[PDB]
DNA sequence: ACTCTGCCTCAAGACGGT
DNA sequence: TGAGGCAGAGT
DNA sequence: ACCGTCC
C-alpha cells in the first residue's frame, strides 16, 4: 500500500477517477490479487466470531467467497484472471519483520482475551493473526480448475504481475483496493469491483494517465512520490507528508535533488535510505510474462465440483449446483468457444 | 494557518426467504 | 493487508 | 432491503 495516496488523487487528481455502472463491463476481463481476495474473506465471512468449515474442522471462508464472488462476476460479463503471490522482494523483508512484531505482539494478547473470559477481545486478536496460507491458495486454485476460471503464479509481488498483464492489454484492468497497482504501473486500477448485489459503492476506475497529467508527472517521479508518501519497501522522510512531498517533488522531480537541496537539520533523511532500491523495484519489478499464458475462461466441471465443494466441504448440494448451472450459463453468454483455422 | 505525527476507534462477504 | 477522527507539536 | 444463516 501507498499512505495516504487514494486521499491525495481525490484532493488534487479528481479526474482520475471514473465511476460506471456494472452494466457498462459486460465482457471486460480484469486481474485480481487473488491472495489479498482470500484475504478479506477469511477476515469477514464469519459466524459467531469463526470462519465457516466443514465438521473435519477445515476452513471454507475463502472457498465460500471465491465460488459466489466469481460467479457473479461472471453472471456481469465480467471475465477475471486470478493472480497468485509469489516470494515476495528481498526489500519487503523490513516490513515483514515488522508484521512478525505486531503478530507475536497480537498473540501475546490473544491469550489474555481468552485466559481471563474476555467477551470481544477475543475476536480481535483473532481476526489480527488471520494469515493466508500455502494451504489456501493450493485450495482456492483447486477450486478456479475446477470452476473453469483461470489463475496464474506471479514470481513476485502479485500486483506488479497484474499491472504487467494490463500493460500488455491482457486484461482491461487490476481489481483490487490497494494503490499499489498503480506505482507498478498499471494503467487502469479498479476498485470495489465486487459484482455484489449489495451495491453500497460505486464502481471507480483510476486511471494512470490522468494523475500523472494533473500532478505533471511522470512515471519515475510518480513512484519517487509514492515512495515519499510511504510504502512497504523503504523508509519515508519524517515531517514530510503528502502536502510537502507533492510540492517537493514537482520543484527537485527526483528524490536525490531534494536530499541535495533538503536542510540536514529541518529534514534529515533516513540513514542508509534505499530510496533507489525501491525505485527499481516499483519501476522494474519481478513479473510474469503476460505473452505465456493464454487467459481462457472454461466450461466449470460440475460434479467435481459437487464432490470437492459438497461432498468434503459440506455446502449445500442445492446452492453449489444452482452455482455452477449459473456460470455455465453466464459463460456461455459471454465467452466464444474455441475456434480452429 | 497549514502541515505532520501518533494516538484512538471502527470496519473488513454473500445467499436467500421474507 | 486501512480509513477517518482527534489532539498536540512542528513549519 | 432486512437479516438469519451459510459451513
Ligand atoms: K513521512
Ligand atoms: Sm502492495
Ligand atoms: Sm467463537
Ligand atoms: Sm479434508
Ligand atoms: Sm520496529
Ligand atoms: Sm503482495
Ligand atoms: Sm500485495
Ligand atoms: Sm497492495
Ligand atoms: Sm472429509
Given at each position: 500500500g501507498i499512505q495516504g495516496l487514494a486521499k491525495l488523487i481525490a484532493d488534487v487528481?479528481?479526474?482520475?477517477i471514473r465511476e460506471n455502472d456494472?452494466?457498462?463491463?459486460?465482457?471486460r476481463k480484469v486481474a485480481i490479487d487473488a491472495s489479498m481476495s482470500i484475504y478479506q474473506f477469511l477476515i469477514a465471512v464469519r459466524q459467531g466470531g469463526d470462519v465457516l468449515q466443514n465438521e473435519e474442522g477445515e476452513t471454507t471462508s475463502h472457498l465460500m467467497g471465491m465460488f459466489y464472488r466469481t460467479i457473479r462476476m461472471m453472471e456481469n460479463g465480467i471475465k477475471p484472471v486470478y493472480v497468485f503471490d509469489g516470494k515476495p522482494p528481498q526489500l519487503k523483508s523490513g516490513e515483514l519483520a515488522k508484521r512478525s512484531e505486531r503478530r507475536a505482539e497480537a498473540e501475546k494478547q490473544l491469550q489474555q482475551a481468552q485466559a481471563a473470559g474476555a467477551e470481544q477481545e477475543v475476536e480481535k486478536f483473532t481476526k489480527r493473526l488471520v494469515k493466508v496460507t500455502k494451504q489456501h491458495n493450493d485450495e482456492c486454485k483447486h477450486l478456479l480448475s475446477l470452476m473453469g476460471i483461470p489463475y496464474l503464479d506471479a514470481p513476485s509481488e502479485a500486483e506488479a504481475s497484474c499491472a504487467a498483464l494490463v500493460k500488455a492489454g491482457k486484461?482491461?484492468?487490476?481489481?483490487?483496493?490497494?494503490?499499489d497497482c498503480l506505482t507498478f504501473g498499471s494503467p487502469v486500477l479498479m476498485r470495489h469491483l465486487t459484482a455484489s448485489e449489495a451495491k453500497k459503492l460505486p464502481i471507480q476506475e483510476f486511471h494512470l494517465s490522468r494523475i500523472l497529467q494533473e500532478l505533471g508527472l511522470n512515471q519515475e517521479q510518480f513512484v519517487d512520490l509514492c515512495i515519499l508518501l510511504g510504502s512497504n519497501y523503504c523508509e519515508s522522510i519524517r515531517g514530510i507528508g503528502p502536502k510537502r512531498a507533492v510540492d517537493l517533488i514537482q520543484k527537485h522531480k527526483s528524490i536525490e535533488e531534494i536530499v541535495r537541496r533538503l536542510d540536514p537539520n529541518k529534514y534529515p533523511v533516513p540513514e542508509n535510505w534505499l530510496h533507489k532500491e525501491a525505485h527499481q523495484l516499483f519501476l522494474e519489478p519481478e513479473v510474469l510474462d503476460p505473452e505465456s499464458v493464454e487467459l481462457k475462461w472454461s466450461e466449470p466441471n460440475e460434479e467435481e465440483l459437487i464432490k470437492f465443494?459438497?461432498?468434503?466441504?459440506?455446502?449445500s448440494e442445492e446452492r453449489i449446483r444452482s452455482g455452477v448451472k449459473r456460470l455455465s450459463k453466464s459463460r456461455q453468454g459471454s465467452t466464444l468457444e474455441v475456434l480452429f483455422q
Amino acid at each position: 500500500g501507498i499512505q495516504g495516496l487514494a486521499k491525495l488523487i481525490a484532493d488534487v487528481a479528481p479526474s482520475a477517477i471514473r465511476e460506471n455502472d456494472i452494466k457498462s463491463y459486460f465482457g471486460r476481463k480484469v486481474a485480481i490479487d487473488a491472495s489479498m481476495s482470500i484475504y478479506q474473506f477469511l477476515i469477514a465471512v464469519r459466524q459467531g466470531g469463526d470462519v465457516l468449515q466443514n465438521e473435519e474442522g477445515e476452513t471454507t471462508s475463502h472457498l465460500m467467497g471465491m465460488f459466489y464472488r466469481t460467479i457473479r462476476m461472471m453472471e456481469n460479463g465480467i471475465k477475471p484472471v486470478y493472480v497468485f503471490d509469489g516470494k515476495p522482494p528481498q526489500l519487503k523483508s523490513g516490513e515483514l519483520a515488522k508484521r512478525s512484531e505486531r503478530r507475536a505482539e497480537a498473540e501475546k494478547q490473544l491469550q489474555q482475551a481468552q485466559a481471563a473470559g474476555a467477551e470481544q477481545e477475543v475476536e480481535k486478536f483473532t481476526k489480527r493473526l488471520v494469515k493466508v496460507t500455502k494451504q489456501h491458495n493450493d485450495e482456492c486454485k483447486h477450486l478456479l480448475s475446477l470452476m473453469g476460471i483461470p489463475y496464474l503464479d506471479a514470481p513476485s509481488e502479485a500486483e506488479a504481475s497484474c499491472a504487467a498483464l494490463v500493460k500488455a492489454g491482457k486484461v482491461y484492468a487490476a481489481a483490487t483496493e490497494d494503490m499499489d497497482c498503480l506505482t507498478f504501473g498499471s494503467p487502469v486500477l479498479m476498485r470495489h469491483l465486487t459484482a455484489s448485489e449489495a451495491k453500497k459503492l460505486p464502481i471507480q476506475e483510476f486511471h494512470l494517465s490522468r494523475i500523472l497529467q494533473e500532478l505533471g508527472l511522470n512515471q519515475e517521479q510518480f513512484v519517487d512520490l509514492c515512495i515519499l508518501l510511504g510504502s512497504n519497501y523503504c523508509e519515508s522522510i519524517r515531517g514530510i507528508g503528502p502536502k510537502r512531498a507533492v510540492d517537493l517533488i514537482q520543484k527537485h522531480k527526483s528524490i536525490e535533488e531534494i536530499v541535495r537541496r533538503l536542510d540536514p537539520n529541518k529534514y534529515p533523511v533516513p540513514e542508509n535510505w534505499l530510496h533507489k532500491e525501491a525505485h527499481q523495484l516499483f519501476l522494474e519489478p519481478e513479473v510474469l510474462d503476460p505473452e505465456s499464458v493464454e487467459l481462457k475462461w472454461s466450461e466449470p466441471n460440475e460434479e467435481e465440483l459437487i464432490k470437492f465443494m459438497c461432498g468434503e466441504k459440506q455446502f449445500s448440494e442445492e446452492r453449489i449446483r444452482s452455482g455452477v448451472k449459473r456460470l455455465s450459463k453466464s459463460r456461455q453468454g459471454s465467452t466464444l468457444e474455441v475456434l480452429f483455422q
